[PDB]
Amino acid sequence: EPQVQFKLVLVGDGGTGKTTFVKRHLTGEFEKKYVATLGVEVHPLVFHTNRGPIKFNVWDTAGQEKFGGLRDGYYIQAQCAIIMFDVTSRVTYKNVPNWHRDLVRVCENIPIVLCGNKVDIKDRKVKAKSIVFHRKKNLQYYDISAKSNYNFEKPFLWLARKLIGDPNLEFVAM
Amino acid sequence: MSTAEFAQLLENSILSPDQNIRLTSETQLKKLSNDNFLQFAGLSSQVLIDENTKLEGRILAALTLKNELVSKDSVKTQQFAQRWITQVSPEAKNQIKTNALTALVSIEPRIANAAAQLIAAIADIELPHGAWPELMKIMVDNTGAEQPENVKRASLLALGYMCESADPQSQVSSSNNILIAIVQGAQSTETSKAVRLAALNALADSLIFIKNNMEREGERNYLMQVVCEATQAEDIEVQAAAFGCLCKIMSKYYTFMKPYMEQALYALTIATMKSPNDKVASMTVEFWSTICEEEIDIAYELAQFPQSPLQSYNFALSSIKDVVPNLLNLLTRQNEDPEDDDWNVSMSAGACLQLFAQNCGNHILEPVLEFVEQNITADNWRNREAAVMAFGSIMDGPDKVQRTYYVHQALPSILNLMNDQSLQVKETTAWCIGRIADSVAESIDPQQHLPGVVQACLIGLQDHPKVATNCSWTIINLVEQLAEATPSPIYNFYPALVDGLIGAANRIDNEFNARASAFSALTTMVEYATDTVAETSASISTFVMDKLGQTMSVDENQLTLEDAQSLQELQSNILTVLAAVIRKSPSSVEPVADMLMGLFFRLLEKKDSAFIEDDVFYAISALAASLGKGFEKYLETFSPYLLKALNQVDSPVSITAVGFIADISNSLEEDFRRYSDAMMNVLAQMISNPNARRELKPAVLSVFGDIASNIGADFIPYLNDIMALCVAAQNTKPENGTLEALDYQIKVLEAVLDAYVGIVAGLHDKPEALFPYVGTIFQFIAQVAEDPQLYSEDATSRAAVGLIGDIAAMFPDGSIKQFYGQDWVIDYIKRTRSGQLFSQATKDTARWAREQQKRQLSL
Ligand SMILES: Nc1nc2c(ncn2[C@@H]2O[C@H](COP(=O)(O)OP(=O)(O)O)[C@@H](O)[C@H]2O)c(=O)[nH]1
Ligand SMILES: [Mg+2]
């Protein structure tokens, strides 16, 4: 059934919190345990805007190589992406350029948000200052916590604004 | 299986609405590649070139074969190479490659792009082996200027993929200069922008691969000339890509850059930096950041290796005259719209100005401060905001004397800008004040400037939320830096600051994080609170307890997902402050511990407590530690949460649960009897749990020590079980041979000590109870005597030598005298009394052990 919707592919190292971020948005539940995603899981997230609903069909992909499934095959027809890493784990940050490259080789020009997750944890190893990923046109960075809900909506508001071409789109109380 | 059926599988994997149809197809594809790779590889190549298959399926056909040829994991990389080399027939390999080269030249770009990835993957496997020797000629021929646009573009893209993918070179032959092929596609004689882009991007992908070429002046001069021309192209995306290449070249081949910087690169990057086009200026700013970043890195390397043949050319340092004023001018291209949070050229300019300050230190001051002095009172807000941004941007790099001095001059005018009409001026001013607090807090004279800074922050908290947020951040810096001064001037302002922060925390929403940051600031206020400002801590705890109350008497059934998640963010914020209050001022909440525990239990009782459970468990545990005996009223209703926590033997929470058992045993002291039977049986099952994480075993073994020392004769029923756990633990060897595995055995052994010290202290009046185990205790003391990693720890030896003494004191009737005439015991006591190796406390305890040992032998 016709509606305003976008395919969003969520990628990033295992453990960085991709599935946890999606479930909170989906049901409000915070998942404590690590249960690695097998290939991909698809869920729709609906946001109510001042131009009515926007739907993101979120493909939550596996970050562990062993469980990758179709890998960059899942990116086919993606209209936007989120790359996630763990602010507490330098290796997950150092893999961001590769996740980025894998995305652009399949989706030449799409809007992408880099999310540095788990900022609720005392000592970060990746400081928000030193991020340079978001310096170009269709790219953006936010600190996020899937657990404290810091900057909960920002990635989706920024994506929606880019995809619709309206800089003053808001997420309104339905 | 036929082409069409395989295409159907591919298409259904990613296009079917039915999620089970997708899984099923994905599973069958993987099964096929496993069972019969030869067939799977052929079929994939056939779907890639088939006009009757949907686009998405053809792309997936290329991608999926590629992902069975190449991998992130270098073990699978070798298996994939060998499976291609050995299982696919020469005929099949030839067809597959032929089909790939046919897709490459498809009139559909997205098919061509996915073909390029497939070609790169095959090439990664075959080129080291000199298989596919036709490929390099085909790619070079395809990039000839006269070839069709799509053929040139797709082949440049493939060459680039191929080059960034070949192993740290070592495979790299003469016929077909790859460099000339790529650089020619970048020439201004190319009509097609798509081809020049493809060329410049392929060139960037190939820079590590073409190293030997770059080290030949002729080839290098030519490449630099073409890339530099490209920067001056009409098309903005071609310009971007040209500067993209320059950045990469500067950072890989810095060592060859002096001649080009002097001939033409310098003057053009300066000119381009004044461009009225924002994107064009950013590109050139990027290049100068890369230069700065490199030279900073070179300086670090040269400090660690002073004889290095590597030399800085100090490009950034030499450029200040020209670059810095142009950067400063770029600061006045801020975005008008306060709701736009995108990166723009003015932010690139600020970032680069900061790198310049770090690189060049004091040399940056004159041009920046000329600018600040000229613009801080300009009529245009853009010039006023650039002024403070420039000033804040040099608060790191120049020495402390210069920064302190210029802060003293600027600060009054900076503080006055908190009254500006312009939102963006106020927002940057609060940020600037923050930077001054963070890097040069002693520059803020306690008498002349601190009152003004505090007032500025207080005004800021009441302003636009974006300004407020920066004020909360600036307050945190002020307090973290000034709370440690010895005559500490900040505590004079705690009440004013706490009051402003509470007001900010009371905002109706969390626009621009104004509310969340206020709660972080409040956490800092609490963390650094001294006794002289105890009243203001009480304010904070009263405020957040009341706010936590509000958040829980909302109409749950009418709350949207959006509403609830905001509410839960606020509860997390609140708990951070309550944790700090409990850690720091446990006394300023115990008068209302009854209502605090009320809130905590209600929080835990809700389903959807998962996000906050641990926070609350930590909080209660730390509160329990402060209440002592006063916490016993909450134990019954806290019980199942403790047990849930004790049973998550894989979570860090169980470690603190064990700690909690230790705390209430120490506070209830003799009254811990009531709970001892339930606690012991739970601790017993945790320690003999296979899945218990490593830290639990010793934590448990120590807490047996605690309990026994608090509970005296009431420990006797557990004595026999616990002693068996200790014997078993003390005879366990390291799991392997690593440092890690050995350090853990010792951590276990230190925990057995704790158990035996506690038990001996506990059974002081009941020696008969300890008597049967004295042999086993000495077996342990013998291990302490034997292992350096135990005996050389001053604490461990003092405890061990203490046991020798204390056990002797317990049996004056001679019943254990035989343990005291052994060679190893005498020598251990002597050693513990001897060198400089152990401390006076340790030596005095050895002296006592020596006296008790002597008394035993004469019995
Ligand atoms: N503290 C904290 N933990 C998180 C956060 N996000 C996720 N986690 C935890 O980190 C683990 C990540 O699991 P998951 O979402 O499955 O990782 P994925 O492989 O990227 O999907 C889980 O145990 C989560 O509870 C966060 O923002 N803060
Ligand atoms: Mg997952």
Q: State the structure-solving technique.
A: X-ray
Give the C-alpha separation, A142 to A116, whole Å: 6
Cβ neighbors of B617 (< 8 A, separation 6 or more) are B641, B645, B653, B656, B657
- If you measure CA to CA, which chain A residue comes closest to B572? A148
Q: Is A36 annotated as a binding residue?
A: yes
Assigned CATH topology for domain A1-174: Rossmann fold (3.40.50)
DSSP conformational letter for B589: T
Q: Is A85 near chain B, with CB under 8 Å? A: no
Contact assessment for residue B200 and residue B228, using Cβ atoms and an 8 Å cutoff:
no
Which residues, in sequence order, are bridge partners of residue A12?
Answer: A84
A34 CB near ligand 1 (under 6 Å): yes
A31 CB near ligand 1 (under 6 Å): yes
Q: How many CB atoms lie within 10 A of CB B218?
A: 8
Domain borders along chain A are 1-174
Question: Within 13 Å of residue A152, how many CA atoms lie on the same side as its CB?
Answer: 26
Contact assessment for residue B371 and residue B328, using Cβ atoms and an 8 Å cutoff:
yes
Cβ neighbors of B99 (< 8 A, separation 6 or more) are B45, B46, B48, B49
Q: How many CB atoms lie within 10 A of CB B766?
A: 15
Give the C-alpha separation, B277 to B283, whole Å: 10
- How many angstroms away from the CA of A49 is the closest CA of chain B? 12
What residues in A contact B279, CB-CB < 8 Å? 137
CA-wise closest residue to B290 among B261, B264, B310, B267 = B261
The torsion angles phi and psi of A86, rounded to 5 degrees, stand at: -110, 115
A23 CB near ligand 1 (under 6 Å): no
A121 CB near ligand 1 (under 6 Å): yes
Distance from the alpha carbon of residue A63 to the mean position of ligand 2, in angstroms: 7
Chain A interface test: which of B33, B236, B611 (most A C-beta within 10 Å): B611
A residues 33..72 contacting B (CB < 8 A): 39, 42, 48, 65-66, 68-72
CA-wise closest residue to B664 among B712, B614, B626, B617 = B626
Q: How many CB atoms lie within 10 A of CB B408?
A: 14
Q: Is B18 near chain A, with CB under 8 Å? A: no
- If you measure CA to CA, which chain A residue comes closest to B114? A106
Give the C-alpha separation, B284 to B294, whole Å: 16
Q: How many CB atoms lie within 10 A of CB B170?
A: 7
Is residue B33 within a helix (H) or strand (E), and if so which, with residue range? helix B19-35
Give the C-alpha separation, B396 to B440, whole Å: 9
Q: Where do we find the tokens 């957040």?
A: B544
A38 CB near ligand 1 (under 6 Å): no
In this complex, the residue of B26, B282, B565 whose CB is nearest that of residue A39 is: B26
Resolution for this model in angstroms, one decimal place? Answer: 2.5
CATH of the domain at B806: 1.25.10.10
Q: Residue B633 is encoded by which pair of tokens?
A: 């009223």
Question: Within 13 Å of residue B25, how many CA atoms lie on the same side as its CB?
Answer: 22
Give the C-alpha separation, B280 to B231, whole Å: 9
Contact assessment for residue B567 and residue B575, using Cβ atoms and an 8 Å cutoff:
no
The torsion angles phi and psi of A41, rounded to 5 degrees, stand at: -125, 135
Give the ligand whose atoms come closest to the C-alpha of residue A11: 1
A36 CB near ligand 1 (under 6 Å): yes
Q: Is B508 near chain A, with CB under 8 Å? A: no
A68 CB near ligand 1 (under 6 Å): no
Contact assessment for residue B370 and residue B320, using Cβ atoms and an 8 Å cutoff:
no
Q: Is B39 helix (H, G, I), strand (E, B) or coil?
A: helix
Contact assessment for residue A44 and residue A67, using Cβ atoms and an 8 Å cutoff:
no
Question: Within 13 Å of residue B154, how many CA atoms lie on the same side as its CB?
Answer: 27
- If you measure CA to CA, which chain B residue comes closest to A134? B343
Ion ligand 2: residues, Cβ under 5 Å: A 18-19, 37
Which atom of ligand 1 is nearest to A62's Cα?
19
- If you measure CA to CA, which chain A residue comes closest to B240? A136
Give the ligand whose atoms come closest to the C-alpha of residue B650: 1
A140 CB near ligand 1 (under 6 Å): no
In this complex, the residue of A30, A70, A98 whose CB is nearest that of residue B611 is: A30
Q: How many CB atoms lie within 10 A of CB B265?
A: 22
Which residue type does B431 have?
Answer: W
Distances in whole angstroms, Cα of residue B429 to Cα of each of A128, B386, B470: 20, 10, 9
Give the C-alpha separation, A105 to A101, whole Å: 6
Distances in whole angstroms, Cα of residue B354 to Cα of each of B345, B425, B429, B455, B663: 14, 19, 17, 28, 50
Domain span including residue B438? 1-859
In sequence order, what DSSP letters do the residues of B80-93 get, joined into one string? HHHHHHHHS-HHHH
In this complex, the residue of A28, A72, A98 whose CB is nearest that of residue B564 is: A28
What residues in A contact B565, CB-CB < 8 Å? 24, 28, 149, 152
> What b/e readout covers B46-65, taking b as 16+ CB neighbours within 10 angstroms?
bbbbbeebbebbbbbbbbbb
Q: Is A55 annotated as a binding residue?
A: no
A147 CB near ligand 1 (under 6 Å): yes
Chain A interface test: which of B562, B617, B691 (most A C-beta within 10 Å): B562
What residues in B contact A48, CB-CB < 8 Å? 562
Give the C-alpha separation, B751 to B743, whole Å: 12
Q: What burial class does residue B605 get, using C-beta atoms within 10 Å of its C-beta: 0-12 exposed, 13-18 middle, 19+ buried?
A: exposed
**CA torsion, points B711, B717, B719, B724, in degrees to nearest 10?**
-140
CB contact under 8 A, A148 and B569: yes
- If you measure CA to CA, which chain B residue comes closest to A131? B351
Which residue type does B389 have?
Answer: M
Q: Is B337 near chain A, with CB under 8 Å? A: yes
The torsion angles phi and psi of B822, rounded to 5 degrees, stand at: -80, 145
What residues in B contact A148, CB-CB < 8 Å? 569, 572-573
Give the ligand whose atoms come closest to the C-alpha of residue B572: 1
Structural domains of chain B, count: 1
Q: Is A122 near chain B, with CB under 8 Å? A: no
Instruction: Give Cα B292 distance to the centre of its chain.
Output: 25
- The helix-helix angle for B739-762 and B696-711 (nearest 10°) equals 10
Give the ligand whose atoms come closest to the C-alpha of residue A117: 1
| Segments of chain A assigned E as strands | 5-12, 40-49, 52-61, 80-86, 112-117, 139-143
The torsion angles phi and psi of A2, rounded to 5 degrees, stand at: -50, 130
